[PDB]
């Protein structure tokens, strides 16, 4: 059984509070990070070199996301707004207002004409990128929303909530098309579509990741061994080399699992606080991790497979 050999290449220092989210640009050149320090920072994905700071949110940012053409960012902030940013200029193009409480999660659709957001206010909102107007407010959940994600062709949105549910939404109509629940309903702290759109990967605050056939409502794979009972930790499919599942962990490690066999294939040590965000590079076997208030650093790791 082949294993990866991720090894630490750079530690990115600069944020002055918890780092909430790290994301590689779709073109592979950049890493964007958001922080409780209200700032977005752009770094070089291959050298870890700081590039620029982007500012404007009035409170902490918990998430940031790239447009498909690597030119735009959207960020989700505790100040109850999202912001659309032109990265090369650093300027705020639109402030999306409408959520009544902290905005926790955000994403562009692949067409880059829509943004989906999720909030402590228990709603999922779909926004007009160009007008900055809210097109739809979905009464998505009965507890705070922890993640939102478009599928590969943008026809579906998946959302996860502390109410213990994952829900699938028809982008065009706003109709809920699926409610996923298994044997219990611990808070669903993270969710996203698989790269091929066929599956979802969902984290629950019972130290568990689950791969779901959401069409058939079947859990296909279960990954355990890490610690996750409190924080909304972002997970990923790693597809550039071996087929892995990657997630942070509340014991300060990055965990990597064999997607098919569910066994832990590597644990990456180095952070000094909860690893709350991980990201996989779009073409190279590179992982970014980011940690909370008692660490404040991003780390870049590289593997031969």
């Amino acid at each position: 059984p082949v294993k990866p050999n991720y090894a630490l290449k750079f530690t990115l220092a600069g944020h002055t509070k918890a780092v909430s989210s790290v994301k590689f640009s779709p073109n592979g050149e950049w890493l964007a990070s958001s922080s409780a320090d209200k700032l977005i920072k752009i770094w070089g994905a291959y050298d870890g070199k700081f590039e620029k700071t982007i500012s404007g949110h009035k409170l902490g940012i918990s998430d940031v996301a790239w447009s498909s053409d690597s030119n735009l960012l959207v960020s989700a902030s505790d100040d109850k707004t999202l912001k659309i940013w032109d990265v090369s200029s650093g300027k705020c193009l639109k402030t999306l207002k409408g959520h009544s409480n902290y905005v926790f999660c955000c994403n562009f659709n692949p067409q880059s004409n829509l943004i989906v957001s999720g909030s402590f206010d228990e709603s999922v909102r779909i926004w007009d990128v160009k007008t900055g107007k809210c097109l739809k407010t979905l009464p998505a959940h009965s507890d705070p929303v922890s993640a939102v994600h478009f599928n590969r062709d943008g026809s579906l949105i998946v959302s996860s909530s502390y109410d213990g549910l994952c829900r699938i939404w028809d982008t065009a109509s706003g109709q809920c098309l699926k409610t996923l629940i298994d044997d219990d309903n611990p808070p669903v702290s993270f969710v996203k579509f698989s790269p091929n759109g066929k599956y979802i990967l969902a984290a629950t605050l019972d130290n568990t990741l689950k791969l779901w056939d959401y069409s058939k409502g079947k859990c296909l794979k279960t990954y355990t061994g890490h610690k996750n009972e409190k924080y909304c930790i972002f997970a990923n499919f790693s597809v550039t080399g071996g087929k892995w599942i990657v997630s942070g962990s509340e014991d300060n490690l990055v965990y990597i699992w064999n997607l098919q066999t569910k066994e832990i294939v590597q644990k990456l040590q180095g952070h000094t606080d909860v690893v709350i965000s991980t990201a996989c590079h779009p073409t190279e076997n590179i992982i970014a991790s980011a940690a909370l208030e008692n660490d404040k650093t991003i780390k870049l790791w590289k593997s031969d497979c």
């Binding site: 918890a18 409780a36 409170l59 902490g60 918990s62 505790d78 902290y102 402590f120 507890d143 502390y162 808070p187 208030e293």
Partner: protein, 303 residues
């Protein structure tokens, strides 16, 4: 004046998570809330955990048992319902929930009602039906206190909310006290004749200023059960996206309840989460942080 009698941390936990306390009706037992939303009963002398109930999906911030031992109010941090009323007779179970009220108290003379606070707004509920009997809010009179807590007066006929005195029967505002701080909305003195609003002691007979008590700034207070001594501790002071900090500093103070003259200042050299006394005022229980949150309950003899 406060002799250490007992100390204990939370059983079965890496880091001890006590956040608030009140003695129960049953005597050598103290009820404690925890940072995981649990309510626990502990023998204060041995430190033995006697019972554990899951009450909320976030940390307990505050709790209050009814005088007759049959009922309990709890408040959590961010999860709904924010506050709940629990039946303690026989099976511990939820009687009613107050889904948006961050803080609740029983009425005082006849404990037949609950008063909840949601930001600037007060809600009064019936204990038996759980029905909202009254909402009290007036945006022209609001002071917008950041830590507003609505509260009944000793005879339940008046409410203080956001620095506005309300006549319950008529659901009418009878007086707005001016705003002299950002956070504290004030409480009724047990004698029923004055209110304590941060550093200002106001006469209810005339609305004149009886006392300036600078040491009460940003303080929560509680009285001994005779109304002769007042305990005061100062809030620590500044977005729920931060790690858990103790609500209070490292000292509390006692005051003569009649003239507000200081009696003692007690520096426990650790941040304080809560304190309470038993109905006989033999004992003082203080939840204290060791040192990161890792709290103990310390029991002291009241001299």
């Amino acid at each position: 004046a406060f002799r250490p009698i007992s100390v204990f941390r939370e059983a079965n936990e890496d880091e001890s998570g006590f956040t608030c306390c009140a003695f129960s009706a049953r005597e050598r037992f103290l009820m404690l809330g925890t940072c995981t939303g649990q309510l626990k009963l502990y023998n204060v002398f041995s430190g033995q955990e006697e019972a554990s109930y899951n009450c909320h999906n976030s940390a307990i911030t505050h709790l209050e048992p009814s005088r007759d031992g049959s009922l309990l109010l709890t408040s959590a941090t961010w999860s709904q319902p924010l506050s709940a009323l629990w039946g303690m007779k026989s099976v511990f179970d939820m009687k009613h929930s107050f889904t948006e009220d961050h803080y609740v108290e029983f009425s005082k003379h006849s404990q037949d009602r609950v008063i909840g606070t949601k930001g600037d707004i007060a809600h009064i509920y019936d204990i038996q039906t759980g029905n909202k009997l009254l909402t009290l809010f007036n945006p022209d009179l609001a002071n917008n206190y950041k830590r507003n807590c609505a509260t009944f007066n000793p005879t339940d006929d008046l409410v203080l909310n956001d620095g506005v005195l309300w006549d319950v029967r008529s659901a009418q505002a009878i007086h707005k006290f001016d705003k002299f701080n950002m956070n504290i909305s004030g409480v009724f003195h047990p004698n029923g004749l004055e209110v304590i609003i941060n550093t200002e002691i106001w006469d209810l007979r005339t609305f004149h200023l009886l006392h300036t008590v600078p040491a009460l700034d940003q303080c929560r207070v509680v009285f001994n059960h005779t109304g002769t001594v007042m305990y005061g501790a100062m809030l620590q002071a500044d977005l729920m996206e931060e790690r858990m900090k103790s609500p209070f500093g490292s000292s509390f103070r006692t005051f003569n309840a009649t003239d507000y003259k200081p009696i003692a200042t007690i520096d426990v050299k650790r941040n304080i989460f809560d304190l309470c006394t038993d109905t006989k005022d033999c004992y003082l229980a203080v939840i204290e942080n060791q040192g990161n949150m890792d709290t103990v309950c310390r029991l002291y003899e009241v001299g």
